[PDB]
Amino acid sequence: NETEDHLESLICKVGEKSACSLESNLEGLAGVLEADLPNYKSKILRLLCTVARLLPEKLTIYTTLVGLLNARNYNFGGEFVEAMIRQLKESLKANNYNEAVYLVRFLSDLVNCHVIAAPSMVAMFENFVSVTQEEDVPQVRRDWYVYAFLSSLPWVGKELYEKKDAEMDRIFANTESYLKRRQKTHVPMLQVWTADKPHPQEEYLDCLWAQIQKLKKDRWQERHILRPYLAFDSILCEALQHNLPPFTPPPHTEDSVYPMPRVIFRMFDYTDDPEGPVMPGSHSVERFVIEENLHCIIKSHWKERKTCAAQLVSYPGKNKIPLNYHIVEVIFAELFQLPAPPHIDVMYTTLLIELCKLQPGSLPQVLAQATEMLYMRLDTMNTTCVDRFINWFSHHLSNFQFRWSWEDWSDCLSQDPESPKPKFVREVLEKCMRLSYHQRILDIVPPTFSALCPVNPTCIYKYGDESSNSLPGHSVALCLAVAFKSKATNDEIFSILKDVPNPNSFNPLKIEVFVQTLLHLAAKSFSHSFSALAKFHEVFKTLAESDEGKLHVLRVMFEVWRNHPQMIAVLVDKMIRTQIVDCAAVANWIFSSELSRDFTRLFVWEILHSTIRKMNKHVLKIQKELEEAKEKLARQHKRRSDDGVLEEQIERLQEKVESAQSEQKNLFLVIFQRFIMILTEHLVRCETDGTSVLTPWYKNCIERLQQIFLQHHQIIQQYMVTLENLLFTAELDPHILAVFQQFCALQA
Amino acid sequence: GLLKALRSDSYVELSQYRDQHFRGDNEEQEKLLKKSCTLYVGNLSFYTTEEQIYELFSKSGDIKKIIMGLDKMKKTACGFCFVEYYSRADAENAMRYINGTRLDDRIIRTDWDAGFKEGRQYGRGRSGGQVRDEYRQDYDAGRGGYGKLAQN
Amino acid sequence: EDDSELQRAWGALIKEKEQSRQK
Numbered sequence: 001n002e003t004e005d006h007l008e009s010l011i012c013k014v015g016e017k018s019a020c021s022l023e024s025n026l027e028g029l030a031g032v033l034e035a036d037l038p039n040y041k042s043k044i045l046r047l048l049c050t051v052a053r054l055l056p057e058k059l060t061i062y063t064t065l066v067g068l069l070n071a072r073n074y075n076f077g078g079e080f081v082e083a084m085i086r087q088l089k090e091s092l093k094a095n096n097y098n099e100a101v102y103l104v105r106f107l108s109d110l111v112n113c114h115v116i117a118a119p120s121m122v123a124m125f126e127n128f129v130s131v132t133q134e135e136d137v138p139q140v141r142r143d144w145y146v147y148a149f150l151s152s153l154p155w156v157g158k159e160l161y162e163k164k165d166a167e168m169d170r171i172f173a174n175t176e177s178y179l180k181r182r183q184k185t186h187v188p189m190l191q192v193w194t195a196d197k198p199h200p201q202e203e204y205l206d207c208l209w210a211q212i213q214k215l216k217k218d219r220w221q222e223r224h225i226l227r228p229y230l231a232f233d234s235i236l237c238e239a240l241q242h243n244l245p246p247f248t249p250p251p252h253t254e255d256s257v258y259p260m261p262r263v264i265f266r267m268f269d270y271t272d273d274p275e276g277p278v279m280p281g282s283h284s285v286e287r288f289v290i291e292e293n294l295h296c297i298i299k300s301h302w303k304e305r306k307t308c309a310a311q312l313v314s315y316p317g318k319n320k321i322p323l324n325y326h327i328v329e330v331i332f333a334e335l336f337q338l339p340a341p342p343h344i345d346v347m348y349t350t351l352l353i354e355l356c357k358l359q360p361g362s363l364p365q366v367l368a369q370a371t372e373m374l375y376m377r378l379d380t381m382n383t384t385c386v387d388r389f390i391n392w393f394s395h396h397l398s399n400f401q402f403r404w405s406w407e408d409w410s411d412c413l414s415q416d417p418e419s420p421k422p423k424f425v426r427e428v429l430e431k432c433m434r435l436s437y438h439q440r441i442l443d444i445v446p447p448t449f450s451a452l453c454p455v456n457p458t459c460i461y462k463y464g465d466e467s468s469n470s471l472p473g474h475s476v477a478l479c480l481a482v483a484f485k486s487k488a489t490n491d492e493i494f495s496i497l498k499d500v501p502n503p504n505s506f507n508p509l510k511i512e513v514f515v516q517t518l519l520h521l522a523a524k525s526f527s528h529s530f531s532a533l534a535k536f537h538e539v540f541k542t543l544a545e546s547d548e549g550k551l552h553v554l555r556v557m558f559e560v561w562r563n564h565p566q567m568i569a570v571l572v573d574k575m576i577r578t579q580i581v582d583c584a585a586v587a588n589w590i591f592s593s594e595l596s597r598d599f600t601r602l603f604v605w606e607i608l609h610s611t612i613r614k615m616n617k618h619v620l621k622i623q624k625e626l627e628e629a630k631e632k633l634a635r636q637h638k639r640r641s642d643d644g645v646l647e648e649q650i651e652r653l654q655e656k657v658e659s660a661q662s663e664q665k666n667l668f669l670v671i672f673q674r675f676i677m678i679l680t681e682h683l684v685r686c687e688t689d690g691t692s693v694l695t696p697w698y699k700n701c702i703e704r705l706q707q708i709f710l711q712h713h714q715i716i717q718q719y720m721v722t723l724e725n726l727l728f729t730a731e732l733d734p735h736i737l738a739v740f741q742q743f744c745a746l747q748a
Numbered sequence: 749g750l751l752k753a754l755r756s757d758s759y760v761e762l763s764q765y766r767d768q769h770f771r772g773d774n775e776e777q778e779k780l781l782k783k784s785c786t787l788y789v790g791n792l793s794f795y796t797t798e799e800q801i802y803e804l805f806s807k808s809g810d811i812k813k814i815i816m817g818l819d820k821m822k823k824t825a826c827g828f829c830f831v832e833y834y835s836r837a838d839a840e841n842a843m844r845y846i847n848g849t850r851l852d853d854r855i856i857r858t859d860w861d862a863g864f865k866e867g868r869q870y871g872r873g874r875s876g877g878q879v880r881d882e883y884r885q886d887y888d889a890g891r892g893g894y895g896k897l898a899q900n
Numbered sequence: 901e902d903d904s905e906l907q908r909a910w911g912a913l914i915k916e917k918e919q920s921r922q923k
């Protein structure tokens with residue numbers, strides 16, 4: 001164990017900033033490993049493999065190290081190469097592919113260290129590219145194979161071209177032929193910005209191909225990647241080269257899942273920093289290397305924010321670059337990447353806070369500039385990305401005493417109030433109020449912005465003292481109020497609710513009066529509302545037996561609490577959890593006529609996504625319970641064989657999981673049906689009226705449909721068949737069907 | 749296997765604080781902590797309402813419950829609370845990220861808990877407030893004012 | 901662990917922005 005922990009720490013120490021030059025530490029580490037070679041061969045091989053798989057940002061270093069070991073022990077190099085091939089095959093079979101990319105890159109860089117012969121790796125990359133010639137195969141897998149090839153190229157391209165220029169040219173021709181005839185249907189769904197200026201959000205494969213071509217035009221002369229092995233030009237040159245075995249890629253299987261396509265998040269230019277080192281161009285492989293290294297650094301240390309910030313700040317490079325701008329750009333790319341960020345968003349905001357703390361003289365200005373540029377380009381930003389931006393900016397301001405030069409954004413006052421910029425400002429102020437008190441937000445915005453401030457979060461009771469008595473249900477409301485103040489029981493509340501002149505089993509006036517009084521009396525805190533809802537839960541169940549009752553309860557709750565959207569969301573959450581209203585009722589309420597004015601607000605879609613997440617978590621929980629029961633049944637059966645009620649319980653759990661899956665299917669079907677209905681209604685109205693179809697309402701609605709698809713692709717891949725057969729058909733309007741087609745191409 | 753440096757998470761490790769009124773040994777307390785989903789949030793302001801905490805901590809995952817820190821006698825907010833999540837992952841994320849973040853211009857300290865039991869929502873301080881409030885001497889407006897020792 | 905330095909930096913930055921707009 002001591003030898004194990006020691007060796008691990010030792011192998012993971014190389015790379016960290018040290019007084020001794022990197023070359024000296026590498027040589028010492030190689031010598032130490034060779035010294036203990038004959039007793040820990042397998043351990044050393046496994047440690048090096050896992051380090052190559054889990055620390056891509058340090059790639060070159062470890063690469064060199066292997067070469068140094070190969071420069072002394074040929075057998076070690078051969079065994080290590082075989083282990084790498086085996087690990088890569090395991091990763092491909094394991095359906096994880098980022099590790100496969102990192103291992104392929106490690107192998108590619110091993111060529112520079114004179115560990116692997118160039119011709120063998122040229123053959124391996126030839127097979128990679130020839131995978132694009134397969135028939136009846138998802139485009140995602142061909143895309144990934146070409147991506148692995150082109151991403152390995154920045155590291156071993158010089159050597160491969162110098163050794164096998166003809167075969168490399170043929171491989172490039174095949175890659176160009178493939179890239180010419182690719183499908184770009186998925187791009188608009190994933191682009192953060194639809195605008196072509198000032199920075200197109202080009203597809204990742206197209207961007208990488210452009211950068212590789214620029215590098216090839218530059219005679220493969222790159223100026224960023226560290227190449228420690230160069231310092232050992234002598235030592236590494238006398239080493240004998242190994243030959244890879246003919247590598248055939250694992251055959252496509254129906255169980256195979258491939259990484260989804262991504263769009264490069266470009267938002268900075270060299271002109272944005274006219275004082276620091278020149279920023280590498282968008283179509284320069286240096287930019288890609290920097291972005292990938294920073295993404296890997298974030299992924300490795302995504303848990304601890306302080307360590308991640310320290311590592312990001314101290315990212316080394318052959319030539320100086322504007323590190324602050326690169327860090328901000330990659331962090332925003334992670335936050336805004338679609339379908340979902342690699343990690344949680346609160347992590348990104350806190351990491352930006354920590355980075356600003358680490359570098360308080362430069363980074364805050366870069367963050368302010370980035371925020372201003374993000375605001376300026378709001379006219380075409382994705383609504384999902386707009387929500388993420390709103391949340392991040394609200395949290396940032398909350399962390400910095402809600403200080404900002406709002407006057408710089410004064411241009412949003414003049415234009416339409418529903419437009420992306422004033423809408424973003426309103427939603428940001430609403431979130432800021434959510435993280436503070438209403439009066440605190442009125443004191444920070446300049447008086448000219450008062451129109452965009454949030455409304456006071458106060459309850460609206462229809463049966464107030466000033467309210468007229470003509471409204472039916474005033475006496476009953478007063479009686480219910482006094483009963484509530486008297487610590488009433490459910491039976492006597494039912495008794496008082498007995499006397500209601502039913503306008504029509506389901507009474508709308510009864511539900512209205514009850515819910516209004518209950519919410520008004522518990523309109524001081526969330527705890528009070530929770531206690532009142534739970535205490536009178538039986539009344540809710542009795543009055544909300546039917547779907548109409550649940551919809552009316554939701555409508556009345558919205559009417560009472562419309563200036564306090566956080567209260568709406570919390571109350572809906574509690575009602576769903578308590579089973580007062582199902583998820584279908586909430587989904588129908590979101591598209592109800594009452595919420596047409598608030599349809600484009602962020603809290604509505606937060607509520608919808610929270611309900612979907614609740615359903616997903618419920619299904620997962622019941623599935624986990626069923627799996628645990630089945631596993632314990634198998635364990636008991638095997639133990640008994642080695643030497644009735646449980647089967648009934650298993651069948652009951654199977655029934656419950658089947659019901660939960662059916663409920664999830666119904667929820668998603670209902671949501672898609674309502675989205676289709678609203679969008680087709682708008683499109684028909686625009687066609688008959690001869691007006692423009694691209695309006696803020698349409699943009700928001702279509703982007704929210706896209707948001708549902710993107711967030712819950714993992715669960716909609718199951719319903720794919722019924723979605724294609726019932727909702728999304730040929731007869732559907734092309735505008736709406738485009739979202740479904742893009743979702744289809746996302747993982748196909 | 750997996751690199752130990754990456755597996756490190758210093759923001760989620762158990763703190764040196766242990767409950768003083770718990771009926772049990774330290775082994776059982778640690779067993780409860782290792783699977784608990786409840787977090788103690790401290791250094792709040794007396795005027796920090798439940799809604800702001802709900803927002804800040806629901807930003808890091810779904811919340812099961814929130815219990816404000818009332819005073820022992822006056823029954824008013826004391827500057828602490830308990831946030832109970834539905835899963836351990838959300839609580840871990842809250843410790844990783846919400847910890848150290850500002851809420852109402854105050855640095856919020858988030859710590860693990862052994863769960864909530866009736867009577868834990870009141871400050872153990874003999875003056876009705878929190879022990880730190882009773883012992884502190886610096887003027888903190890968000891915490892009512894001077895420490896309870898200064899006036900009496 | 902007080903980040904007053906960062907707070908002062910942000911305050912000065914926003915003050916400079918406001919002054920530049922005013923001028």
Ligand SMILES: C[n+]1cn([C@@H]2O[C@H](COP(=O)(O)OP(=O)(O)OP(=O)(O)OC[C@H]3O[C@@H](n4cnc5c(=O)[nH]c(N)nc54)[C@H](O)[C@@H]3O)[C@@H](O)[C@H]2O)c2nc(N)[nH]c(=O)c21
Pocket residue numbers: 765767768787788790828859860861862868869870871872873877878879880881883884
């Ligand atoms: C700080 N904290 C409080 N809770 C919970 O909040 C409720 C009321 O607490 P409280 O605010 O009444 O203080 P206690 O913790 O009861 O007593 P504490 O301050 O820990 O006692 C400190 C001991 O050191 C003594 N002491 C001696 N000198 C000093 C001093 O100079 N300053 C302070 N503050 N204490 C001193 C003090 O009198 C006492 O004997 C209860 O549930 C608490 O458990 C916490 N829960 C978790 N999970 N993690 C925490 O960090 C945490």
